[PDB]
């Protein structure tokens with residue numbers, strides 16, 4: 001397709017985050033940047049760190065402009081402190097443009113960088129509302145759209161076990177099968193969506209849909225897990241246990257505190273259930289559902305003869321987070337121009353001969369507006 005040079009522009013090292021190459025400054029300094037739809041700051045390591053092999057050297061960039069302002073960003077996991085400035089930025093396997101963007105130079109950090117992950121910075125792709133220090137700091141994608149012809153849309157295919165594609169300015173049809181189904185972006189801060197029903201192996205969890213979105217639900221490539229509010233998590237685990245009852249696992253397995261390992265190639269995927277989230281559709285009273293497999297929610301942990309797994313659905317107190325566990329099933333289109341997020345079955349998603357991830361619709365769901373928290 002026309003976007004062929006952007007295909008396979010993502011990498012990941014042992015499932016520690018999906019990253020794209022970005023080139024900053026003049027002369028060029030290329031760094032590996034984690035793609036994060038769950039935050040809105042573009043920040044790069046800019047000083048030595050034990051887990052960094054490279055970092056941004058501002059003094060070597062003739063085009064660097066100091067903003068004379070500090071910045072601090074805490075995440076659910078980790079935090080960093082740094083210094084704001086602007087510089088020229090291109091994505092060599094992305095759009096054919098160069099923009100002047102805000103960049104946070106990370107000088108100190110706590111549990112942010114990940115040993116062996118091979119990434120050295122983060123690209124926050126969400127909206128200005130959640131940027132630090134405040135919403136006046138234009139996020140990267142906003143700058144790209146304001147300064148260039150590039151359409152206000154990007155799409156992500158995260159390929160689990162690895163790699164994937166970030167298509168910028170459009171969609172590449174080779175990256176998915178079947179149809180794309182869209183859910184509204186409820187509000188432009190996080191990529192906020194509304195979940196209207198949850199099923200485990202076709203069985204309705206039967207919770208009030210308000211519980212699924214308390215206090216928000218977001219699509220977040222920078223978060224590994226499917227994170228669920230406590231009440232929802234507990235109900236989900238109870239149902240998943242019931243569905244997989246032909247095998248018993250320690251309580252701590254469901255809490256992510258214990259791993260279970262199988263002999264290489266023998267993992268009984270079939271004994272674990274599929275999980276479906278229904279999302280609000282584009283038409284009144286219309287929904288669709290996305291369905292993931294245990295291959296998505298049971299994550300490998302790297303004897304070479306043993307395949308060890310961690311259960312990667314976990315508890316949150318800050319609403320639902322549809323992280324990599326969800327996104328790895330799908331090609332996800334962040335259609336900012338039309339304030340909607342599209343899902344289609346990923347051409348690269350991990351499955352088996354018996355089951356596949358699915359995106360299906362339409363369904364009829366009433367009173368979906370009520371599901372959202374106010």
Ligand SMILES: C[C@@H](NC(=O)c1cc(C(=O)N[C@@H](Cc2ccccc2)[C@H](O)CNCCC2CCN(Cc3ccccc3)CC2)cc(N(C)S(C)(=O)=O)c1)c1ccccc1
Nearest residue numbers: 015016017038039075076077078221222223224225318324
């Ligand atoms: C890079 C790595 N990410 C993580 O290991 C990870 C990052 C995060 C995380 O915070 N990611 C942020 C970006 C990041 C951080 C650190 C290293 C690399 C990337 C995202 O930006 C978070 N997105 C926003 C989440 C909301 C934040 C605000 N809050 C509400 C709140 C709470 C307190 C105070 C104010 C507001 C709700 C959730 C979280 C978590 N979890 C808590 S978990 C075990 O359930 O999966 C795991 C990864 C590995 C594989 C695939 C994708 C990503």
